[PDB]
Design an enzyme around this catalytic site. Sequence first.
Site, PDB file in Angstrom:
ATOM      1  CD  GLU B 357      -2.766  -1.090  -0.219  1.00 46.91           C
ATOM      2  OE1 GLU B 357      -3.125   0.015  -0.677  1.00 46.91           O
ATOM      3  OE2 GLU B 357      -2.996  -2.168  -0.803  1.00 46.91           O
ATOM      4  CG  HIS B 487     -14.148  -9.270  -9.773  1.00 50.88           C
ATOM      5  ND1 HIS B 487     -14.159 -10.112  -8.682  1.00 50.88           N
ATOM      6  CD2 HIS B 487     -13.154  -8.379  -9.550  1.00 50.88           C
ATOM      7  CE1 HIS B 487     -13.204  -9.755  -7.843  1.00 50.88           C
ATOM      8  NE2 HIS B 487     -12.579  -8.706  -8.346  1.00 50.88           N
TER       9      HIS B 487
END
EC number: 3.4.17.23
Lengths: 194, 597
Positions: B357, B487
């Site tokens: 991150e 998805h």
Amino acid sequence: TNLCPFDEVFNATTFASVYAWNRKRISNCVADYSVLYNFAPFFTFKCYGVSPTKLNDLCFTNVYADSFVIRGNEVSQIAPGQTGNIADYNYKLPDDFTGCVIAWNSNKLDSKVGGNYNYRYRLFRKSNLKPFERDISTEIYQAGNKPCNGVAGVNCYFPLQSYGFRPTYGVGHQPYRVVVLSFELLHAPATVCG
Amino acid sequence: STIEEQAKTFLDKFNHEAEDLFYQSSLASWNYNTNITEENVQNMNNAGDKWSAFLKEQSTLAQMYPLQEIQNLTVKLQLQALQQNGSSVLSEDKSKRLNTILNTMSTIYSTGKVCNPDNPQECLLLEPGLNEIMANSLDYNERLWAWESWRSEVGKQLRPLYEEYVVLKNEMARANHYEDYGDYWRGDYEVNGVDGYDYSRGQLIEDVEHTFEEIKPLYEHLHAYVRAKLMNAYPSYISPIGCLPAHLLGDMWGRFWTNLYSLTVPFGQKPNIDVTDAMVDQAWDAQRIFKEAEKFFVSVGLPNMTQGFWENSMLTDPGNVQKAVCHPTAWDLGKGDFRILMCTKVTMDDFLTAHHEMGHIQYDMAYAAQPFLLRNGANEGFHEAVGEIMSLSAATPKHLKSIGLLSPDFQEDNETEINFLLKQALTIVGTLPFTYMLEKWRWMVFKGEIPKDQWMKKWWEMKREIVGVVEPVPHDETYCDPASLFHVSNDYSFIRYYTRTLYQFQFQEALCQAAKHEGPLHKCDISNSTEAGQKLFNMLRLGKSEPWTLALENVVGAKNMNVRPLLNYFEPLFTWLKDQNKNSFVGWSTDWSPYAD
Ligand SMILES: *[C@@H]1O[C@H](CO)[C@@H](O[C@@H]2O[C@H](CO)[C@@H](O[C@@H]3O[C@H](CO)[C@@H](O)[C@H](O)[C@@H]3O)[C@H](O)[C@H]2NC(C)=O)[C@H](O)[C@H]1NC(C)=O
Ligand SMILES: *[C@@H]1O[C@H](CO)[C@@H](O[C@@H]2O[C@H](CO)[C@@H](O[C@@H]3O[C@H](CO)[C@@H](O)[C@H](O)[C@@H]3O)[C@H](O)[C@H]2NC(C)=O)[C@H](O)[C@H]1NC(C)=O
Ligand SMILES: *[C@@H]1O[C@H](CO)[C@@H](O[C@@H]2O[C@H](CO)[C@@H](O)[C@H](O)[C@H]2NC(C)=O)[C@H](O)[C@H]1NC(C)=O
Ligand SMILES: *[C@@H]1O[C@H](CO)[C@@H](O[C@@H]2O[C@H](CO)[C@@H](O)[C@H](O)[C@H]2NC(C)=O)[C@H](O)[C@H]1NC(C)=O
Ligand SMILES: *[C@@H]1O[C@H](CO)[C@@H](O)[C@H](O)[C@H]1NC(C)=O
């Protein structure tokens, strides 16, 4: 033998936004730039014309003190010749500059959690500002050739954009209160000593 | 006076208005994501709503400067981005119907539950109930029940919605001059009008298939090996030449084979590497983890995090009083404000996720100087690839030893690295045919190549042929198993993961070459290598102001996607699999099924 605005300018309440910088005649009075140079929290204390504390020993005819507010990337422009966004559309330093530029952070007061839009710049102007010129005129910008009779819309925008000042900004986008001390000295009676 | 000058001025107005409004929206979204309260649900919604409205207004305003009379490539990019109206090219009726269908499918997926056949008031959601079953259970019948009931209870609801979704999205895409909605998605990789770097929307198809052909050997050997091990675990269920049953693959769909590690670890006794105990023994807190991530990125020449990052990021679970959204996320609010939101635990998983991150954050700080519209990755696969190569470097024993967590008396052998590479392949290589096939089925359905009456029939053929996976229950066309994944029923292009996997290994290899790394690629740490960091920053600083092909060449010196770094990373385990399978069938027959007896 009176002392020069010392706290009137620097230790003020609110600074003017940069498009409408107020200029104060700092004259007929002994200045305390001897010991004010040593406070030293300033994030950019650079005099582009003379020595910092040596200038006591030289009276000047009419010191002009211009005070406003910008950000850290805008501070790089309050400089002689530098033409970014701010030194050619509101407050340009002459190429033959001789005075001072004092810059310190201001987040603690000039930024409010929720968009302090009081402090503004000019981003649009038909022509590049001329040395030591103030433009405050709120005429709509005529970008599109079309007639924009006070109209706010296509290819014509309000020439004043406010810094959305906030505490949680990067140090470059943060507020900076900034004062420029134009030292001038000529045949006119020199009454600013130290 | 000219069209390009007026467009430049329009975009100049737009960028400043957009910085302010987008910062509003991001801060309300943070507010909510850190300090859950119905109140700043309302604030997040109102801020995001003003932002949405500003975008629609500025998009209508932007369509008033034609790209045909604009030459500045970067200006043309920004205006083309602001001009993609999207679903506002349909009729308002059809747009409200499309949005209604999207929301219905989303809440069906998020609120679809199955209840056991013995207690009509005890039920499991996908997350966490059925996911915990599919990720931890070794009993065959429990797994089969979970799989089939998720695809029949919730998939059957999603079938008709998905059909109407196909019709409306094909209308939407044909109305913006794409041949279909899949071509619209492929439009992310499009590059026009830069000689030596252009890229068409069908070229993505061709390169994906060509590189997948080269991946096929590695995957066939991994498949045969996993089959050998599972067939050792389920003798009366799996054929030694057949496809793998869908519901024994680790998760609800066989998207990742990671949870098969317990059942396929080559040297199941060799100690696995996990520095969690050591972090706890040396009094590490989350502060220390993120400080080490910052230290890594500085070691190669990148800047350390802004004081705002440390004053404002939420790096721990903020107690029990206020609830928070703990999914690890990197936030670029713009105007110099970068944060990370992560409920960090003093573990190695969270240690690696922190560097991932913070790699996102470093990418954001690099292109911070770009215009508002170009503050993003080169294409849809660049951010996650950047994040992955950080975990790759910081996971290696050289780095763990470097930062004091792993002792210098740790013995890397030819078994523990095979265990490592096998887990890596179960996660990374395992998802590749799955992703390719899923997006290919979508691309064909959007192009019109699969009739409705054959949808599922084609799906499970493609499962058998490309992936090596057979369905455990025959499904007629009342199902919509594609939509049963997050998805497909929430409208997201999938090829991004394939492309990201390939990109990340191209990056890691180029950087490890610039870092003068000796030995196999998977062991490489790019720490203390300012030249690798400079080679990467040369592409990070671009954002999406140059074609994604050019951004890639800035790192790897090549203009196209390429599998050879993947295969080079995995070559040791490749040869090991070739050896282990000397007493196994490699490949699969598509006609075997657990229900056909
Ligand atoms: C999470 O959000 C809530 C919602 O605001 C925060 O509660 C606020 O806590 C502060 C003290 O921490 C208090 O401020 C009070 O505000 C009211 C209204 O402006 C004012 O009349 C009081 O004199 C006081 O200043 C109050 O409990 C509350 N503020 C509100 C309701 O506006 C909470 O602090 C947030 N959590 C974090 C991480 O700070
Ligand atoms: C396409 O449009 C852009 C937008 O104007 C053009 O780039 C601009 O180029 C000018 C002149 O080279 C840049 O001004 C420069 O400013 C820097 C301050 O960093 C100063 O050091 C230089 O002396 C010069 O005055 C301006 O930054 C730049 N705009 C940007 C970077 O957004 C560009 O030339 C046009 N054409 C092409 C092919 O890019
Ligand atoms: C953030 O980066 C700055 C800039 O590189 C670091 O400053 C260096 O610090 C080391 C050790 O403290 C010194 O030996 C260098 O001389 C410093 N160089 C410069 C140019 O400042 C700084 O250490 C980093 N931040 C923190 C909190 O450590
Ligand atoms: C990156 O450079 C630093 C600085 O030389 C290395 O860390 C030092 O290693 C020495 C010898 O092991 C020890 O004195 C300290 O633990 C570290 N600090 C200093 C100031 O020397 C680090 O090992 C290098 N990276 C790798 C992967 O070796
Ligand atoms: C790993 O090392 C041991 C050391 O004796 C050796 O016997 C073994 O053959 C090596 N690896 C393989 C794959 O055989």
